């Protein structure tokens, strides 16, 4: 079912510890998602015999009960881990989630950003959710998974009426009898971090298209200090930082799920994995998250300046350029305070703009 109803303390004896109740929750919810779809069933009578033995004891003690529940739970988690890793391909499901929600295959989504910006504007409730899904699945059908991917239904913030490139949803329906590792809340949090990673990919892609300044293009208040060059190097370095944090957590997750044989340990590693991704990709509220929001806005306004000028020409662009250099210095000290948590990805950099202090003294 999993339309289950949870085990809480208005209805639990309060002398029974809670941790036993979430373990019993695990055991029962797996029985729910195999009673249906018949158009752990080899040892159910042993479990019934142990429950009858627990009924037989007139002076209950909690420690023996906890040991019996642990004895049930170990075999339960072993059966669930063996079934869900082998027959339903749990590693493949994690790879699909990494490719689509955490953007482990950023190539297809980069081409999707190359084909659409018009949802920098806002959606009215009929129409544009169809357009994002059709365009994304066709641009995926050109090359690199033509056979599949007609299964993610792309929603942005298309509940309709607000921007959406920092707010692209994604709904992918998982196998519910064969995978209870994924919950709707887990997919919801993956959807939020998917929104965040979309925004940074958009802004870096637009700025490298203006690196065509270099495929195409007077000094001192024309060449926007070529601050195309000053802006793109530091944004691309932070892009590499989000890169190596996503790979570090994903590789740790795959080794962790391969090492152990209990499905509860898979779930603890999975929740730890998503919590680390949220903490380290600056989804958590910090001044570092404030810095990344401002660097997104600075890159977007900067690309809007440098796209329409073609070659070097003074279109009264110096008035924008002054705001750009001042915000550039403010987020300069802020990417200094990004720049090392105690986590090797976020630690990978407080030497990388702190050395000659053109952003510590300017």
């Amino acid at each position: 079912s999993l339309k289950q109803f949870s085990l809480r303390v208005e209805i639990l004896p309060s002398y029974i510890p809670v941790r036993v109740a979430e373990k019993i929750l695990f055991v029962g919810e797996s029985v729910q998602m195999f009673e249906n779809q018949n158009v752990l069933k080899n040892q159910e009578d042993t479990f019934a015999a142990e429950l009858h033995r627990l009924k037989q004891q007139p002076l209950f003690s909690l420690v023996d009960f906890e040991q019996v529940v642990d004895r049930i739970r170990s075999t339960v988690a072993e059966h669930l881990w063996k079934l869900m890793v082998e027959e339903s391909d749990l590693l493949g499901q994690l790879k699909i989630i990494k490719d689509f929600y955490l953007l482990g295959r950023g190539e297809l989504f980069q081409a999707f950003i190359d084909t659409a910006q018009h949802m920098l504007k806002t959606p009215p409730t009929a129409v544009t959710e169809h357009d994002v899904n059709v365009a994304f699945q066709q641009s995926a059908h050109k090359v690199l998974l033509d056979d599949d991917n007609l299964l993610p239904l792309l929603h942005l913030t298309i509940e309709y009426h607000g921007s959406g490139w920092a707010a692209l949803g994604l709904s992918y329906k998982v196998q519910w009898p064969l995978h209870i590792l994924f919950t709707p809340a887990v997919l919801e949090k993956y959807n939020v971090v998917f929104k965040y990673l979309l925004s940074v990919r958009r802004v870096q892609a637009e700025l490298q298209h203006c690196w065509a300044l270099q495929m195409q293009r007077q000094t001192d208040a024309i060449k926007w200090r070529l601050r195309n060059h000053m802006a793109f190097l530091v944004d691309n370095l932070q892009y590499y930082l989000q890169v190596d944090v996503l790979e570090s957590q994903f590789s740790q997750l795959l080794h962790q799920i391969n090492s152990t044989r209990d499905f509860e340990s898979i779930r603890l590693a999975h929740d730890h994995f998503l919590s680390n991704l949220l903490a380290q990709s600056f989804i958590l509220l910090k001044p570092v998250f404030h810095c990344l929001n401002e660097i997104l806005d600075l890159c977007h306004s900067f690309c809007s300046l440098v796209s329409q000028n073609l070659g070097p020409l003074d279109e009264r662009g110096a008035a924008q350029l002054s705001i750009l250099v001042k915000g550039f210095s403010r987020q300069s000290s802020l990417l200094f305070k990004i720049l090392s948590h105690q986590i090797n990805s976020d630690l990978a950099q407080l030497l990388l703009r702190l050395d000659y202090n053109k952003y510590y003294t300017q």
């Binding site: 950023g106 490298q208 060059h229 370095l237 000659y356 053109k358």
Partner: protein, 420 residues
């Protein structure tokens, strides 16, 4: 994205043929193009997906008075490529005048290969400065690519003529082609005859057959620089985003290219970065410092060592740069190729902009000026007379490279609101 090699010059055609046999050994392919049984990865950066999984390499062969095509004809690499892409002097001006009259059909060849590819983003050139046939024709081809394609890239993997003062006509040709490379090419990877020859004499025991080992060195360098494009990583695998971090100064686009195995026949990333920042491991020839550094490490690498190596490299002040911005040293990772026939799969590369190359450019700024004062080595060729009557194009090239020197020295300063 996808780039098409335009080989020109004698050593340019040699490194083109060496590059294609290097990629034939690198990928799991036959010398007909057919997929093997030990070869999913991407094979679409230099190869069209032709008829029977024939990964046909997209290339343009240009020269004058053909020499190397005979060696192509009696080899199994006339059965790998050439469905019709092979086109058949000694000075820059003669090559310029010869390329002027046949600009139509070579531009038709460029259009044919651009229509052949599926995603055109840049034209990469495997060229040799003062290779004979390459001088003049290469610069005119650069002018044609700049005029016809301002929206695409021009990449030049090239060697530059330095003999430590041999041939007395090559400084004029190299300075004119260098001015054409500044104004009409988008990125230049610079190499030298003395640097590659000195490292070849160091790691081996040769001195006379320099060309055949320079072919191997340039092929390994070009394969290392395009390893992340040919074999899928997930950082900046388009050429535009990769060279976007590589050029910090928009006129100073000449990049240092080091390679930690000089011969490919254990190590940490800290040690090869300390090796790789030293100029003795670099195949490229006062206050000199970088502007921005990037390095690419491919092999059996632990990523937390890339962390600690970057930390210690920037803090111990061996990344030497005084920029007018925050531009810094950058780490980058790549996956080493599955089914390399080469052993010892740990290899490192650096792509950094250094002002020390200006000093080497200053040698050319000496040489032409010296050969303009003696006046027996401009040689008074008539093609140079019909190229320009006043001979002020060489003075224009000297002015452009003098601006380049002053821009290197201004990029050493914390101000680039003033260059000379």
């Amino acid at each position: 994205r996808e780039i098409i090699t335009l080989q020109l010059g004698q050593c340019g055609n040699q490194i083109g043929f060496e590059f294609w046999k290097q990629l034939c050994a690198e990928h799991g392919i036959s010398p007909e193009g057919i997929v093997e049984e030990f070869a999913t990865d991407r094979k679409d950066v230099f190869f069209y997906q032709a008829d029977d999984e024939h990964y046909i390499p997209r290339a343009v062969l240009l020269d004058l008075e053909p020499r190397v095509i005979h060696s192509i004809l009696n080899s199994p690499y006339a059965k790998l490529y050439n469905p019709e892409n092979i086109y058949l002097g000694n000075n820059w001006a003669s090559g310029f005048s010869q390329g002027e009259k046949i600009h139509e059909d070579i531009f038709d060849i460029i259009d044919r290969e651009a229509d052949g590819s599926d995603s055109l983003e840049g034209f990469v050139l495997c060229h040799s400065i003062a290779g004979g046939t390459g001088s003049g024709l290469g610069s005119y081809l650069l002018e044609r690519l700049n005029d016809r394609y301002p929206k695409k890239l021009v990449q030049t993997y090239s060697v530059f003529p330095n003999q430590d003062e041999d041939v007395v006509v090559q400084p004029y040709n190299s300075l004119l082609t260098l001015k054409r490379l500044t104004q009409n090419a988008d990125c230049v990877v610079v190499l030298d005859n003395t640097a590659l020859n000195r490292i070849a004499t160091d790691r081996l025991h040769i001195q006379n057959p320099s060309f055949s080992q320079i072919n191997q060195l340039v092929s390994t360098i070009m394969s290392a620089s395009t390893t992340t494009l040919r074999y899928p990583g997930y950082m900046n695998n388009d050429l535009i985003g990769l060279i976007a971090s590589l050029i910090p100064t928009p006129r100073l686009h000449f990049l240092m290219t080091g390679y930690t195995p000089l011969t490919t026949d254990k190590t940490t990333v800290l040690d090869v970065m300390r090796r790789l920042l030293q100029p003795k491991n670099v195949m490229v020839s006062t206050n000199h410092c970088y502007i921005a550094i990037l390095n690419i490490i491919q092999g059996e690498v632990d990523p937390t060592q890339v962390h600690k190596s970057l930390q210690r490299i920037r803090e111990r002040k061996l990344a030497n740069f005084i920029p007018w911005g925050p531009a810094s040293i950058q780490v980058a990772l790549s996956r080493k190729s599955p089914y390399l026939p080469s052993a010892h799969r740990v290899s490192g590369l650096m792509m950094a902009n250094h002002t020390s190359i200006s000093s080497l450019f200053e040698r050319t700024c000496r040489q032409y000026d010296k050969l303009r004062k003696r006046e027996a080595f401009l040689e008074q060729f008539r093609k140079e007379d019909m190229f320009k009557d006043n001979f002020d194009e060489m003075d224009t090239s000297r002015e452009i490279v003098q601006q380049l020197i002053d821009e290197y020295h201004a990029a050493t300063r914390p101000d680039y609101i003033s260059w000379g």
